[PDB]
């Protein structure tokens, strides 16, 4: 019949290849995908009342915080990624940019940069997390102020334990300084802006940069949300969306679930089995998006038995 998949924008390229593989082994199946920012993909199910067979997110923790237990009973952590600052040969100061000086280039008034909507998209809130965490790493308590506070409607407070809390207003009230910032609904619409030279820099994932042939600044492991060992450092920044939901700096870990209100749950089991199996792993390696092999799952007693063999 019809397989409805809601997935992250960074998952577009591997999910296209996964679709072609799934339709080759299942002839009468039409896989319709809706790519959006992960929080918005989750909000399709939990708030708009839309039904999906597969939900895959760029931040696994959106599943237990927003879906469990009304819309989901389990999740499996399947992939990793890394935040970089992407650019081309047409980008200003691209010859002179590195790990040590990226934010000073971003500080310049003739330099325009891009990130996605933090209310809707993990990459959008991660850009904020990366930028704030840079303050303690580089011993410069004005990086977040110069780049984000002076140019948007976002505000910062400090929690009692020392954690920085970024407040995101309504999406229309973010009101970016057009000279400095291009904002988009999802991270994958800004790729066309970086190609044409409309922006100079772009906070996106390493997998996406490799998918477009972009040059990238390899940001430090302490701030780039890539390494498990730096999880205690990443947790010192939180982002609050307009609806009052709080996301926490953590390593970038992708998560999949089959919702409770899925129409084709039996067929959804097979897609996720393909995803977690050796075929799915290979597709993810090829697109520069490190798979978690074997996949880490919670709520295993609620999982289908076919999928229980593939998880930890």
What number of chain residues touch ligand MOO (CB under 6 A)? 11
φ, ψ at 215 (rounded to 5°): -80, 150
- What does the angle CA 167 – CA 170 – CA 176 come to, to the nearest 5 degrees? 80
Sites for ligand MOO among residues 16-55 (CB under 6 A): 37-38
- Do the Cβ atoms of 155 and 175 come closer than 8 Å? no
Least spacing, CB of residue 39 vs ligand MOO, in Å: 7
Q: Which of 121, 200, 240, 270 binds ligand MOO (CB under 6 A)?
A: 121
**Residue span binding ligand MOO (CB under 6 A) among the ranges 116-124, 189-197, 277-285, 302-310:** 116-124
CA distance 217 to 215: 7
Least spacing, CB of residue 63 vs ligand MOO, in Å: 13
Tell me if 8 contacts ligand MOO by CB under 6 A: yes
Q: Which is nearer to ligand MOO, 35 or 149 (CB)?
A: 35
Q: Which residues is 167 bridged to in the sheet?
A: 155, 240
The DSSP annotation for 68-135 comes to TTTT-S-EEEEEE--EEEEE-TTSTT-SS--TTTHHHHHHSTT--EEEE-TTT-HHHHHHHHHHHHHH
From the list 79, 51, 91, 88, the residue with the least C-alpha distance to 67 is: 51
Q: Which is nearer to ligand MOO, 4 or 10 (CB)?
A: 10
Least spacing, CB of residue 308 vs ligand MOO, in Å: 27
Q: Which of 14, 114, 118, 122 binds ligand MOO (CB under 6 A)?
A: 122
3-state secondary structure of 305: helix
Tell me if 217 contacts ligand MOO by CB under 6 A: no
Q: Which is nearer to ligand MOO, 111 or 133 (CB)?
A: 133
Residue keyed to tokens 């199910």: 45
Tell me if 224 contacts ligand MOO by CB under 6 A: no
Least spacing, CB of residue 72 vs ligand MOO, in Å: 17
Sites for ligand MOO among residues 227-286 (CB under 6 A): none
Q: Which is nearer to ligand MOO, 53 or 120 (CB)?
A: 120
- Residues of the shown chain interacting with ligand MOO in the complex, contacts defined by CB under 6 A: 8-10, 37-38, 58, 121-123, 186-187
């Amino acid at each position: 019949e019809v397989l409805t998949v809601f997935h992250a924008g960074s998952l577009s390229v591997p999910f296209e290849e996964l679709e072609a593989e799934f339709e080759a082994q299942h002839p009468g199946v039409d896989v319709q995908r809706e790519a959006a920012g992960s929080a918005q993909s989750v909000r399709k199910i939990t708030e708009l009342g839309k039904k999906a067979d597969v939900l895959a997110s760029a931040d696994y923790a959106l599943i237990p915080s927003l879906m469990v237990p009304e819309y989901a009973d389990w999740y499996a952590a399947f992939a990793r990624n890394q935040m970089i600052l992407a650019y081309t040969n047409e980008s200003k100061y691209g010859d002179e940019i590195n790990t040590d000086n990226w934010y000073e280039i971003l500080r310049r008034p003739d330099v325009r940069y891009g990130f996605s909507n933090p209310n809707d998209d993990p990459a959008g809130y991660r850009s904020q997390m990366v930028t704030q965490l840079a303050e303690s790493y580089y011993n410069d308590d004005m990086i977040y102020d110069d780049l984000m506070l002076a140019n948007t409607g976002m505000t910062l407070t400090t929690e009692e334990n020392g954690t920085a809390l970024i407040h995101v207003p309504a999406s229309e009230e973010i009101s970016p300084n057009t000279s400095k910032i291009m904002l988009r609904s999802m991270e994958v619409e800004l790729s066309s802006a970086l190609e044409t030279g409309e922006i100079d820099y772009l906070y996106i994932y390493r997998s996406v940069a490799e998918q477009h042939g972009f040059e990238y600044v390899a940001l430090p492991p302490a701030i780039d949300l890539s390494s498990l060992e730096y999880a205690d450092n990443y947790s010192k920044v939180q982002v609050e969306m307009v609806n009052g939901e709080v996301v926490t700096g953590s390593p970038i870990v992708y998560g999949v679930t089959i919702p409770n209100n899925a129409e084709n749950s039996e067929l959804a089991t097979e897609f996720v089995a393909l995803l977690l199996g050796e075929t799915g792993q290979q597709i993810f390696i090829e697109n520069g998006q490190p798979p978690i092999v074997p996949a880490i799952a919670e709520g295993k007693d609620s999982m289908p038995e076919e999928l229980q063999a593939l998880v930890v």
